[PDB]
Amino acid sequence: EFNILLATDSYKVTHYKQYPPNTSKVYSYFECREKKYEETVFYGLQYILNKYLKGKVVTKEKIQEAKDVYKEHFQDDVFNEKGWNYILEKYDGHLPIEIKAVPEGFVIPRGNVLFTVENTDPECYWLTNWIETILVQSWYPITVATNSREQKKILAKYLLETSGNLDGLEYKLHDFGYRGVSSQETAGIGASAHLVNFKGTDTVAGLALIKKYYGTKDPVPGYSVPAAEHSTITAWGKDHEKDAFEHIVTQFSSVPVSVVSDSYDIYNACEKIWGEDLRHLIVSRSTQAPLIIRPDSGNPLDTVLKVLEILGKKFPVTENSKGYKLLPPYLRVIQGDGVDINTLQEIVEGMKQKMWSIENIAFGSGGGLLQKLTRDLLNCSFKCSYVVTNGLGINVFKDPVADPNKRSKKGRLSLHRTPAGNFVTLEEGKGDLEEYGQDLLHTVFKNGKVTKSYSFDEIRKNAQLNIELEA
Amino acid sequence: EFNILLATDSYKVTHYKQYPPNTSKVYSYFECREKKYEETVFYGLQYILNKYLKGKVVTKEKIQEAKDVYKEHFQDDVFNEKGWNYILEKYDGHLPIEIKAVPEGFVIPRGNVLFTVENTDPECYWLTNWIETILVQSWYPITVATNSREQKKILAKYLLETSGNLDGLEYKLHDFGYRGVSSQETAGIGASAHLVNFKGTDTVAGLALIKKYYGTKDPVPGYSVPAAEHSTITAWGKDHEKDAFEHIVTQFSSVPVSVVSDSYDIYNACEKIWGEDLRHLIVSRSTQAPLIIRPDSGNPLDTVLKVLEILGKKFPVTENSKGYKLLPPYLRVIQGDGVDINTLQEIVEGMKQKMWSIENIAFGSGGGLLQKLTRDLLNCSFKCSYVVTNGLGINVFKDPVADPNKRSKKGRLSLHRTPAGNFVTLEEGKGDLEEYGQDLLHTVFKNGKVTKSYSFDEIRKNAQLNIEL
Numbered sequence: 051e052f053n054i055l056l057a058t059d060s061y062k063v064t065h066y067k068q069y070p071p072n073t074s075k076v077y078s079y080f081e082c083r084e085k086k087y088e089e090t091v092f093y094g095l096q097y098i099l100n101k102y103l104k105g106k107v108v109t110k111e112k113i114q115e116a117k118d119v120y121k122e123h124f125q126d127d128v129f130n131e132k133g134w135n136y137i138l139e140k141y142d143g144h145l146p147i148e149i150k151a152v153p154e155g156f157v158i159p160r161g162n163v164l165f166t167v168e169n170t171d172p173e174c175y176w177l178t179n180w181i182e183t184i185l186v187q188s189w190y191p192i193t194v195a196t197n198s199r200e201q202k203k204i205l206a207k208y209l210l211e212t213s214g215n216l217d218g219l220e221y222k223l224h225d226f227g228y229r230g231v232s233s234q235e236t237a238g239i240g241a242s243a244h245l246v247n248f249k250g251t252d253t254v255a256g257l258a259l260i261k262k263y264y265g266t267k268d269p270v271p272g273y274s275v276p277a278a279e280h281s282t283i284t285a286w287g288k289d290h291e292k293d294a295f296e297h298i299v300t301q302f303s304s305v306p307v308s309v310v311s312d313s314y315d316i317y318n319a320c321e322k323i324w325g326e327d328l329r330h331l332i333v334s335r336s337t338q339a340p341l342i343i344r345p346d347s348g349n350p351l352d353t354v355l356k357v358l359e360i361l362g363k364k365f366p367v368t369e370n371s372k373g374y375k376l377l378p379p380y381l382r383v384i385q386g387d388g389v390d391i392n393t394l395q396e397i398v399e400g401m402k403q404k405m406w407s408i409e410n411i412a413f414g415s416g417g418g419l420l421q422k423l424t425r426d427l428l429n430c431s432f433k434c435s436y437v438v439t440n441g442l443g444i445n446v447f448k449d450p451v452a453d454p455n456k457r458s459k460k461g462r463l464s465l466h467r468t469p470a471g472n473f474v475t476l477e478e479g480k481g482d483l484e485e486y487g488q489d490l491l492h493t494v495f496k497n498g499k500v501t502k503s504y505s506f507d508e509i510r511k512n513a514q515l516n517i518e519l520e521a
Numbered sequence: 522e523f524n525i526l527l528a529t530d531s532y533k534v535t536h537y538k539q540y541p542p543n544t545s546k547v548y549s550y551f552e553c554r555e556k557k558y559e560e561t562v563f564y565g566l567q568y569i570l571n572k573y574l575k576g577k578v579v580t581k582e583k584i585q586e587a588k589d590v591y592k593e594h595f596q597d598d599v600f601n602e603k604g605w606n607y608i609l610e611k612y613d614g615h616l617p618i619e620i621k622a623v624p625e626g627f628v629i630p631r632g633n634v635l636f637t638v639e640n641t642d643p644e645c646y647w648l649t650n651w652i653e654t655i656l657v658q659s660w661y662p663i664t665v666a667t668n669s670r671e672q673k674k675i676l677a678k679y680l681l682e683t684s685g686n687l688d689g690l691e692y693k694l695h696d697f698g699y700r701g702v703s704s705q706e707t708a709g710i711g712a713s714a715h716l717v718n719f720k721g722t723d724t725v726a727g728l729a730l731i732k733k734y735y736g737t738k739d740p741v742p743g744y745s746v747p748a749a750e751h752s753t754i755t756a757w758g759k760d761h762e763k764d765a766f767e768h769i770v771t772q773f774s775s776v777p778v779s780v781v782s783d784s785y786d787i788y789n790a791c792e793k794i795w796g797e798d799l800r801h802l803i804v805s806r807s808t809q810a811p812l813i814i815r816p817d818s819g820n821p822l823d824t825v826l827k828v829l830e831i832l833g834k835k836f837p838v839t840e841n842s843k844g845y846k847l848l849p850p851y852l853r854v855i856q857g858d859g860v861d862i863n864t865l866q867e868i869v870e871g872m873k874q875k876m877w878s879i880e881n882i883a884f885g886s887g888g889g890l891l892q893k894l895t896r897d898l899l900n901c902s903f904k905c906s907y908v909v910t911n912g913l914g915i916n917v918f919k920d921p922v923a924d925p926n927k928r929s930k931k932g933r934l935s936l937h938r939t940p941a942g943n944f945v946t947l948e949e950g951k952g953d954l955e956e957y958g959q960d961l962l963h964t965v966f967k968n969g970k971v972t973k974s975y976s977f978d979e980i981r982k983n984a985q986l987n988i989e990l
């Protein structure tokens with residue numbers, strides 16, 4: 051059983067005693083602070099609201115559990131039992147909090163308010179920042195979605211340049227990250243964030259999350275194809291790599307199949323096994339059922355180029371309408387080793403320089419896609435900007451002398467369209483002057499209820515690339 | 522609920538069709554592959570075994586659910602319903618798998634077998650590697666525990682050099698990482714791994730995991746103290762920082778209290794507010810209840826040194842028996858911004874050069890401790906090393922031409938003590954020759970039951986530093 055009273059940084063347990071006496075309101079906001087990721091995809095808050103924040107989250111038992119834990123953890127009695135009992139008694143354990151947020155899937159420049167949080171009962175001034183820790187974890191799906199979308203931009207540029215269209219773009223970056231993330235929960239969240247931009251995943255945990263919390267018109271949001279791993283090749287024995295390849299492509303003769311080909315010698319596998327011994331089994335396959343050769347070691351760019359050169363000499367290559375080389379439709383490659391946003395760029399650029407179409411390749415990314423990311427990448431941060439004490443509203447902020455990048459926003463915030471159609475965040479309650487039209491934030495949570503939500507299909511639409519929008 | 526049939530990489534669903542015909546056994550192993558970080562702390566498997574692998578993990582409903590999902594996911598019917606049905610009917614949904622592992626807390630050099638996995642029923646040859654994905658996630662608590670321990674070694678060396686002892690070492694690196702990790706589950710796992718080495722955490726989720734899966738003689742494995750955040754200072758208004766500080770230290774007058782002091786001007790706060798206006802509230806505090814000043818911005822080394830320099834001129838500093846400067850016992854500092862293993866080393870070395878004892882300082886680390894880590898750091902990896910096909914055992918491995926670092930081990934494996942007291946992994950079933958004493962791997966899981974468990978106290982004992990011993 052999850053217990054929201056035990057789901058905060060320890061020190062926050064002591065904060066109710068630290069605010070100015072007679073504080074009735076604490077108002078805080080989240081942004082990806084400006085400091086190259088100029089825009090972020092807002093995604094993942096809906097998961098958190100539904101799984102952790104909504105409904106009766108306080109019970110008599112949960113209060114007692116927290117009291118008992120904090121008594122030992124602090125070696126002292128500092129826990130606000132009275133405050134949590136008030137919520138239990140007055141609101142039947144529902145949080146007296148209002149959260150306003152930008153729509154999920156929205157692409158917003160850095161340094162804008164993405165969501166705000168405030169207490170709706172003056173007794174619960176302390177509650178706004180109690181939940182900072184859980185809400186700040188939204189950094190992760192935001193950052194995965196954003197970084198995934200940035201790779202989609204690279205892929206789109208090079209696919210458009212080398213082929214003249216964006217066909218298959220949404221299958222060009224496949225999630226390999228299930229084993230390489232830190233937990234089952236993280237796998238579901240991160241995989242779901244990648245699926246904002248793409249349709250290919252092996253991280254099955256993502257499907258159930260999307261189905262439960264977001265929803266799609268389609269049966270599933272993401273897809274895969276049969277494929278080998280090293281164990282299904284090496285199990286045949288070192289001298290029988292060819293027998294393994296033959297068995298596998300024959301088992302999957304009518305659907306696409308990927309076969310990892312570097313167990314012993316990738317160049318030999320491509321040139322002699324696929325290119326000669328088993329060539330008859332490849333050239334006979336359907337366009338809907340290609341063999342996808344998967345190298346998995348060595349320098350990613352050099353290995354990709356070498357594999358393409360080998361296959362290009364063993365199989366009939368054509369030249370597409372843009373003048374780039376194209377493998378026959380029954381044969382493709384996937385590079386799924388050492389892929390992150392930097393190496394992805396290096397590979398597609400290297401392919402372009404060697405006149406190979408990006409149509410030839412897909413990418414699998416694991417740790418690079420889902421794990422090698424931190425809160426510091428987009429500077430996702432939650433800060434108090436407004437309080438009411440003794441009935442007087444005060445605009446509050448931090449502004450550290452040695453780091454202007456850490457300066458926080460002041461006062462009540464709102465998000466607006468500028469006359470040129472861009473976003474701007476108004477501070478100090480200035481949105482009230484109505485010089486910039488309506489606040490674009492929507493109330494998504496109020497007093498224990500989720501009040502606005504988005505389907506996964508709408509989130510995908512919101513997160514589209516401009517170039518996809520053109521077409 | 523959680524469904525083990527849906528907790529694997531998609532492609533593994535199709536592997537049962539790909540192994541050699543007449544394969545009755547697939548045996549696989551996990552190591553932190555060799556390519557600093559020369560030794561790893563083995564920790565976290567017990568959590569995975571209990572939460573996900575033990576007991577009745579297959580039901581009719583879970584089989585049907587998986588069948589439905591994979592039909593849409595692959596746009597094809599490739600799922601091994603018959604295989605999962607067999608486990609359900611024959612073993613009441615318990616996994617016919619045996620796992621042998623080195624004891625948790627053990628500190629083992631890179632490139633050694635840490636655990637092995639094999640099927641116990643020939644029909645379930647495909648199951649060994651089905652659960653690779655979930656078992657490989659053990660990389661995370663292993664890596665957190667290892668990286669946390671490496672920081673403990675740095676702290677230990679500098680604390681010993683500058684103070685002559687290791688008093689308080691176990692409170693010198695505090696977990697600040699709750700908000701900076703990717704999920705609630707990750708928070709609990711990562712925090713528990715840090716607690717293998719230290720006793721200070723704000724990541725409360727770690728305590729419940731330890732209580733549920735491991736257990737301690739003490740009521741809790743980790744502790745904290747009251748402390749401010751920027752919001753509890755800034756809420757008073759920019760002109761009232763002093764009022765905020767006064768209120769907070771007075772509220773927590775007889776326990777340790779940490780106060781973030783960089784909301785507007787850290788140097789002013791130390792020199793004028795703490796150092797003059799409120800000095801009388803600081804010098805009256807108990808040794809058991811110090812003020813801990815917390816800078817939180819700027820170059821971490823430069824800021825730590827400047828803060829110490831300021832405090833050193835406003836408060837009575839002593840020189841310890843090693844010749845290093847020491848703040849009075851009612852006053853300490855914690856640096857909790859931008860701390861990772863590299864910057865930690867930079868700070869303590871910089872302090873030593875400026876003749877400041879490491880006694881003066883503690884470190885808080887968040888993303889650096891629990892999030893800025895990947896499976897590539899220790900090359901945690903799971904590979905098949907032995908199969909039985911047509912009744913014959915075959916030693917198998919990968920050995921990619923362009924990367925010798927990715928070569929895997931061959932055959933049945935065992936872990937042993939060398940004559941010199943080090944570790945060695947024997948390959949090709951050579952452990953059976955009994956020339957290297959007893960196998961250090963113990964059966965921890967067999968046919969759906971956890972067969973050997975460790976308390977958190979035992980794990981801590983196993984993971985102790987030599988210098989502590």
Ligand SMILES: O=C(NCc1ccc(S(=O)(=O)C2CCN(C3CCOCC3)CC2)cc1)n1cc2ccncc2c1
Binds near residue numbers: 225250276
């Ligand atoms: O091979 C793996 N998974 C299956 C897979 C293979 C290839 C593609 S793809 O991206 O090449 C994909 C092919 C199918 N085509 C189309 C061909 C025409 O028909 C429609 C699909 C789209 C493009 C997508 C999925 N894995 C999962 C891993 C996890 C961790 N480590 C290693 C792993 C290896």
Ligand SMILES: O=C(NCc1ccc(S(=O)(=O)C2CCN(C3CCOCC3)CC2)cc1)n1cc2ccncc2c1
Binds near residue numbers: 749777779855857885
């Ligand atoms: O202040 C915070 N937590 C409380 C805390 C403060 C100081 C220490 S400490 O490590 O300085 C600790 C002091 C008490 N001493 C005792 C030594 C023996 O004598 C009594 C004091 C040990 C050494 C430990 C815990 N946080 C949590 C955060 C999470 C995310 N971002 C920022 C955060 C700020």
